[PDB]
Design a protein around this ligand. Structure first.
Ligand code: I6C
Length: 276
């Protein structure tokens, strides 16, 4: 399906300790044309890393939805002793970067369109019995101004910490579930309505609440205590009360009282209609 001979480098994208992503062109006709694809390869093919990568490939093979990253195939390099994953290329990259770079193209109607699409992708993942764990705007990708897709870059395996998206029972008991994905979705909705403004990100806000001085595990201890006793990210400037209410309801310490993704999609779509 994808012969290393015809996979031509175009551009270096992300890199981390676990994997790296490149833009490539697949040119089987050798005519300097072909489809542009995004290619992931492993930095170090240990037994565990290759097992993880193979599981990533099997997960992606099973997922087909308009708001989930689109799998294309695999390609073997180094005389078939290395493995690379081929995906559909999305020009605008992460939603976190798109929001910072293209504020001129974004208003509240647009934010709610993206919110709806994220909810629908999460509904789909639940039907596959898949728990995402890593929902955050850094892991949502932008195809164009009208279409976002959930992914999970996973190139590395306080400002950089994923803990600021995690539900309290994930922090205290390592319990990840659909309901903790709903908690993290609430943080995504917060991120959207901050426009990724500097100083207002979840890590920056939580660190201001706990004390910017704190380091190491002390951050975790204070974050758990804060969340367990109703400490929450504040309402973003300009964000409607009804949208903050959705965030608040996702951030319920009572796991079973969080809304479902089907509930959230219906609510967001009904609101979107009314502002449109
Ligand atoms: C604990 C670690 N676990 C391992 C297993 N994992 C499972 C998982 C793995 C993913 N893998 C991706 O999402 C992925 C993988 C590889 C690539 C190349 C891409 C990708 C695709 C399109 C694309 N367009 C661009 N454009 C740009 O960079 C523009 C210049 C800015 C970059 N890319 N990069 C996405 C998605 C899901 C999910 F969410 F779908 F269920 C789940 C989870 C973690």
């Amino acid at each position: 399906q994808f012969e290393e001979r015809h996979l031509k480098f175009l551009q270096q994208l992300g890199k981390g300790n676990f994997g790296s992503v490149e833009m490539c062109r697949y040119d089987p006709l050798q005519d300097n044309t072909g489809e542009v694809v995004a290619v992931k390869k492993l930095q170090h093919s240990t037994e565990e890393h290759l097992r993880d990568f193979e599981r990533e490939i099997e997960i992606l093979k099973s997922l087909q939805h308009d708001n989930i990253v689109k799998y294309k195939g695999v390609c073997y390099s180094a005389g078939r002793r290395n493995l690379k994953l081929i995906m559909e290329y999305l020009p605008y990259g992460s939603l976190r970067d798109y929001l910072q770079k293209h504020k001129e193209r974004i208003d509240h109607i647009k934010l709610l369109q993206y919110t709806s699409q994220i909810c629908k992708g999460m509904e789909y993942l639940g039907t596959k019995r898949y728990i995402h764990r890593d929902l955050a705007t850094r892991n949502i990708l932008v195809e164009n101004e009208n279409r976002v897709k959930i992914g999970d870059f996973g190139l590395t395996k306080p400002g950089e910490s994923p803990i600021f998206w995690y539900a309290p029972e994930s922090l205290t008991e390592s319990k990840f579930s659909v309901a903790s994905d709903v908690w993290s979705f609430g943080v995504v909705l917060y991120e959207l309505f901050t426009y990724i403004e500097k100083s207002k990100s979840p890590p920056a806000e939580f660190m201001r609440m706990i004390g910017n001085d704190k380091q190491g595990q002390m951050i975790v201890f204070h974050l758990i205590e804060l969340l367990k006793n109703n400490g929450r990210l504040p309402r973003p400037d300009g964000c409607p009360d009804e949208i903050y209410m959705i965030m608040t309801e996702c951030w319920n310490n009572n796991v079973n009282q969080r809304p479902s993704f089907r509930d959230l999609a219906l609510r967001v779509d009904q609101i979107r209609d009314n502002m449109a």
